[PDB]
């Protein structure tokens, strides 16, 4: 059945994710103080004052930076800039190539004694089986240079797959929690065990002192299930009690 | 700004770390020389002999 | 978003002043809200600051802008640099500069475009946030500014507009900002814009060389009294551990020395000779640290104090009361610089077979049995003390462990981690641990003194029941050492029986989950056996008063002898292990510390 | 005497004072420097009324919106909730209404819901009018009090009001 | 300001270098301390034999 599984070209319409907050490298102040650096010998003369970054993002099938760039407005960095915007591109799902990459960069937005700060990142679209839906919610790292956590560009957050190990055990359990994996207990004992998982998140949080960030997305209409428009037998990966 | 931030950062890191370090080292090693070096011998005698 | 057209517009060229005038009507038609939407015009303005297009009329529109610009977020601060081009373009700059400098004197003086940084006075995202909340209120808001001319400076007028109220900000520290900075005209341009706002709004090893069998639970066992039917011994040395097979209740036992001692229960049921002599032996060549049967198998797994571990396959003929005898270590597992700690082995029904043992570092190490190789590792902490008991959930999902420090610790195996800890206050080293129907609650056998059991609900952390042999209802610490040291046996099934050694009285009590009041003990007493087992309450626990008629025990030796002569027939050391088996009827074995066993039916 | 146990969940926007409210009730303490909660904290405290010891098993949830998806795990089988807002923050009150709505739709129908207008010691910066909050509470059978974890105002009182309403 | 800035700034590095140094020997001492549990285990075990 595969929830009456249907193809990629059998889909039709635009997309709308959402976008949260970040854990910083802390090179200068939260919000802004005027860039903290002992090489201020010259740098002070550059009028470095308190400031505020923003960002822009487009997309590429690498070789063509295809997409429209789009910019960001304002929220206080006391929130760690936690937006939770719900963020959309009208790009019909059939209009999306299976191999393509996001491109995003820090820029600026509140008129500095400074020139608008760079800070790149890049990562891929599809999951292992090609479905973009594998990317739906995720996390990433980068600096003034450019990086990704889930699919690393070359900076802080620089390796993707084997980093999650106990966190990969958490991903395997996330697939079950998503499936409501039926072979083991999820009663109020396990509800409180999820209280323990809330605990383990914070371990990850120490490790998060590099440059991490939080990403989100999911459907409106549901029950529904889908795949690509071509075929290969990855569905042979299946299980039972 | 420099003086403040450095005063802030240094004083905190220093003073807490001084205090915690002096304590945690003091305690951990004292336990060994008071107990590793004493309880063990005491209960060896009452092991082997007994 | 789509009003970005304002930028690319300047890429179209015209020097007709008419276009610049329609642009002044467009500039009138355009002072707009979004933080980014101002920059498209900024950069059009840059084109205009390369070449000014409409002279003094332009100069006036710019003048109109400059007073509004005397209010600024730092979002506005980029435009300051752009504005330095307008004076950089010599209009005798200094006179017009002077007129405007009076009109925006936030500090008295400055110089060239970079030297524009000096004459600062404060922006405020803060009071503007309050002002956006006040997008709700206009009128009175143009009525308070002329009074603010006096209220700040002069004394021309005073205001009574409290008909509109809205005191809270003026009541708070938010009142202060107008004296310092806040002023009227910015707020009127802002009010215009606020109206615009308002308008927008499994068996791989087990079938290679092992044999197989299936488990055999008894009927409800509260009904039978037990009469001592048999007596025997492994050796004089203490029993290393006891195990009873499901097949023919094949009885496995061993001397402390590492010499095996096995028997056939059906042979005993028949020939009756079985107590005199060993049915089966094996040379281990070292002191047995632990024993556990292979689940669903005739194979038996044994570990030694050298770290060495191995699995015997049974070679036996199938002739009634007459098995051929041969021990055979079928597989081997490594000795190590880390020694052993004890284990139970688990085939998991609809799931795989694995065996788990503790290392000498305290770590659980959990080998896939089919692989005879590791599958998981869970590391215990120096702080907990050693393992004092081991237990597992019905599906093995939650491990439950009692520490040598009197703390109980659990591990989610589904998550492969220690979940957490608890430690009942007296914090004595746990004797044993087990689980009952009403699986949510669990039995802890030695923390505190005179208490027999601190049965506690796993989800709760808390001793839902507390049973004590004490004459007093609270836990008076009347226990001799052997009161805290005992065997126990419980059933999550089979009519819900529980059996309990009282090591103080060296005897087998019974406690029936069906009737705590009617709980006739299975084993006798020489003086006065009868027990008024009535449960009382003092809020916090449903305390069971085991009102044994004349028990004759307390925290000191107030009787001349009171030792091995004082037992229901069959003298012995404390019951190290007690277990039930059911080859024909249900019957029970008591294994004492003395290398000696007595059987009851 | 008898003991009645109830699971209680605290919900509301980050920094409204959920951990402060419960620390006051549980420990009789208040810290100006209280740490933002990660995930959820377990606490317990009792009240006594009508000879009944009422023991609350309290889940103090992290209010941060990333943890929204975890909230249903903590309020599943909860017999009581406190939805907390900050009286100086009208938006915290908008978020409070949306928590109350989620509870109406997705929690046990028997749930006794209390609404806390917290930080009432800062009444000179009031943004949320008492009678507006009361009107919303009355309309939805919520127990409403303005509380201050700081001063202790109405802290014990709100938990007692819950205990009284709960089936005992 | 410049002289004293340099003086004050660069010695913080040296101060904190020793703080990192503490973290190293502490890791070693933890292993040493972990052996206390090994000895305790052995004593308790054979004492449980007694
Ligand atoms: N003045 C005043 N401050 C309070 C009061 N209650 C809490 N605070 C303060 O508000 C801040 C946030 O309080 P918390 O208890 O941590 O808020 P929370 O709702 O638990 O926040 P999260 O855990 O992030 O969801 C802390 O500085 C508290 O000391 C109060 O009643 N009055
Ligand atoms: Mg909190």
Numbering used by the authors:
A (entry chain BBB): 5 to 245
B (entry chain AAA): 251 to 300
C (entry chain CCC): 611 to 701, 707 to 816, 959 to 1358
D (entry chain DDD): 16 to 183
E (entry chain EEE): 201 to 250
Quote the paper.
VPS34 is the primordial member of the phosphoinositide 3-kinase (PI3K) family of lipid kinases, and it is present in all eukaryotic clades. It phosphorylates phosphatidylinositol (PI) to generate PI3P, which controls a range of cellular processes by reversibly recruiting specific protein effectors to membranes. PI3P is generated by two complexes that both contain the lipid kinase VPS34: complex II on endosomes (VPS34/VPS15/Beclin 1/UVRAG), and complex I on autophagosomes (VPS34/VPS15/Beclin 1/ATG14L). Complexes I and II form a Y-shaped structure: a catalytic arm bearing the kinase domains of VPS34 and VPS15 at its tip and an adaptor arm with Beclin 1 and either UVRAG or ATG14L supporting the VPS15/VPS34 subunits.
In order to directly visualise the interaction with membranes, we determined the structure of complex II bound to Rab5a–GTP-decorated LUVs using cryo-ET and subtomogram averaging. To improve the membrane recruitment, we made a construct (complex II–BATS) that has the C terminus of UVRAG deleted (residues 1–464 remaining) and replaced by the BATS domain of ATG14L (residues 413–492)21,36 which can still be activated by Rab5a–GTP. A total of 26,979 subtomograms contributed to the final average resulting in a reconstruction with an overall resolution of 9.8 Å. Thus, Rab5a–GTP is located in a pocket surrounded by the VPS15 SGD and WD40 domain, the UVRAG/Beclin 1 coiled-coil, and VPS34 C2HH insertion of the C2 domain. The C2HH interacts with both switches I and II, while the VPS15 WD40 domain interacts with Rab5a outside the switches. The VPS15 SGD interacts with the surface of Rab5a opposite the switch interface. Instead, it appears that binding to Rab5a-decorated membranes releases the inhibitory contacts between VPS34 and VPS15. Similar allosteric activation of complex I by binding NRBF2 was recently reported. This indicates that the activation mechanism of VPS34 complex II by Rab5a involves both the increased recruitment of complex II by Rab5a to membranes and the release of the autoinhibition. Interestingly, only the adaptor arm is solidly attached to the membrane while the catalytic arm is poised above the membrane. The BARA domain of Beclin 1 shows a protrusion towards the membrane, which is in direct contact with the lipid bilayer.
